[PDB]
């Protein structure tokens, strides 16, 4: 039963290109595919 | 389209080689809801 | 120091042919947010 309130008379400045939950969606999809599509051969550069 | 087996990962920098494709038929029913374009500013069209 | 050696490693896991159908994942906010 989701809770949703419409807020009266409020104005609010957003920003799309500086959201800090887009880098929290990016983390949990790196973490998805690495445990989802396990590959046969990786080639990850180490660069010591 | 193709089906490549040696891709570049989007996750980090690196390549990945996968198994051969599956034997049967492969269906895909996707609904395009978006593009990503890019211009090229010359000096016009 | 400029052309530094980058050892392109190769880790090989055990790779089956697995299914892949993305489900909708919606992000909730913890308590007090």
């Amino acid at each position: 039963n989701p809770q949703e309130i419409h807020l009266e008379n409020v104005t609010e400045e957003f920003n799309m290109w500086k959201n800090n939950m887009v880098e929290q969606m990016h983390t949990d999809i790196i973490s998805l595919w690495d445990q989802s599509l396990k590959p046969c051969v990786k080639l990850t550069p180490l660069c010591v | 389209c193709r089906i490549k087996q040696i891709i570049n990962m989007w996750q980090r920098i690196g390549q990945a080689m996968y198994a051969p494709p599956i034997q049967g038929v492969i269906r895909c029913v996707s609904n395009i809801t978006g593009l990503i374009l890019t211009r090229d500013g010359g000096s016009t069209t | 120091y400029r052309l530094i050696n980058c050892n392109t490693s190769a880790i090989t896991q055990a790779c089956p042919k697995v299914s892949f159908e993305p489900i909708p994942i919606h992000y909730c906010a913890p308590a007090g947010f």
């Epitope: 046969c40 051969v41 080639l43 | 193709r2 490549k4 087996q5 040696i6 390549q15 080689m17 198994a19 051969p20 | 190769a10 090989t12 896991q13 055990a14 790779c15």
Partner: antibody
Framework: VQLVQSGAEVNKPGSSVKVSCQAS????????FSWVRQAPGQGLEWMAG????????HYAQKFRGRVTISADESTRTVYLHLRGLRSDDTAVYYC???????????????????????????WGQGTTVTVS | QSILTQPPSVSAAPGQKVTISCSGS????????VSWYQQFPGTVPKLVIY???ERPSGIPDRFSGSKSGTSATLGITGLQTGDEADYYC???????????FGGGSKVTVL
């Protein structure tokens, strides 16, 4: 990484022989396997070979039909069956393999029928097959 | 049955240079790479030269290789006594669609 083969075999001509080759790795798809033999005192030659990352197999032109290669991924064993046993097959067999990962630096579309057997160093201990 | 024309034996005194030729067509060497393998009689063979000039870890740097035209030369500078084995050159023949070897080259100490 090391490879263990099957036990030595004695036989009569006309039958079919089986030699196994088990890998110590995690999967067979990272290695392009190969079967070479050595008649005692003579040179080396290449019988056949399988690459499971592309599902492709390869046969020498002197050995088509007589030789088949099967690989079981679930047990990580490369199998060789040789049909049409004759006199000169008194030899020792070897299963060898190299890393397949050298074609990731290729020009996008590789070649999925081509040959990527080169400079192996994972030769198993061998199996002596003697016909009578 | 030797498609590659390896000489059957090379010989020199211990502490010198030897050459081993691996001569083939323009569909096994002129387009592809060469390799070299070492086998003591009875024991399993061992790769000694990969990618025409390199050595794996555990190989002395006396073994050198080159690919000239349609043939290849293996050179052992400063021959020791512990090299009592025989050598094989192995390439991929594109026209024959198979890995192709040589007849063998048994080096001998003097």
């Amino acid at each position: 990484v090391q490879l263990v083969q099957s036990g030595a075999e004695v036989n009569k001509p006309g039958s079919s022989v089986k030699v196994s080759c088990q890998a110590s790795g995690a999967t067979l798809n990272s290695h392009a396997f190969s079967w070479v033999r050595q008649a005692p005192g003579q040179g080396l030659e290449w019988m056949a070979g399988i690459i499971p990352i592309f599902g492709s197999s390869h046969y020498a032109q002197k050995f088509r039909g007589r030789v088949t290669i099967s690989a079981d991924e679930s047990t990580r064993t490369v199998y060789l069956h040789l049909r049409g046993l004759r006199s000169d097959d008194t030899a020792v067999y070897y299963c060898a393999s190299n890393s397949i990962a050298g074609v990731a630096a290729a020009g996008d579309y590789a070649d999925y029928d081509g040959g990527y057997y080169y400079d192996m160093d994972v030769w198993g201990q061998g199996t002596t097959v003697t016909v009578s | 049955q030797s498609i590659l024309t390896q000489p059957p034996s090379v010989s020199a005194a211990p502490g010198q240079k030897v050459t081993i030729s691996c001569s083939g067509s323009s569909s096994n060497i002129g387009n592809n790479d060469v390799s070299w393998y070492q086998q003591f009689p009875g024991t399993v063979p061992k790769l000694v030269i990969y990618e025409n000039n390199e050595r794996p870890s555990g190989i002395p740097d006396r073994f050198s290789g080159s690919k000239s035209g349609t043939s290849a030369t293996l050179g052992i500078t400063g021959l020791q006594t512990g090299d009592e084995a025989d050598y094989y050159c192995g390439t991929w023949d594109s026209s024959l669609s198979a890995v192709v070897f040589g007849g063998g080259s048994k080096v001998t100490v003097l």
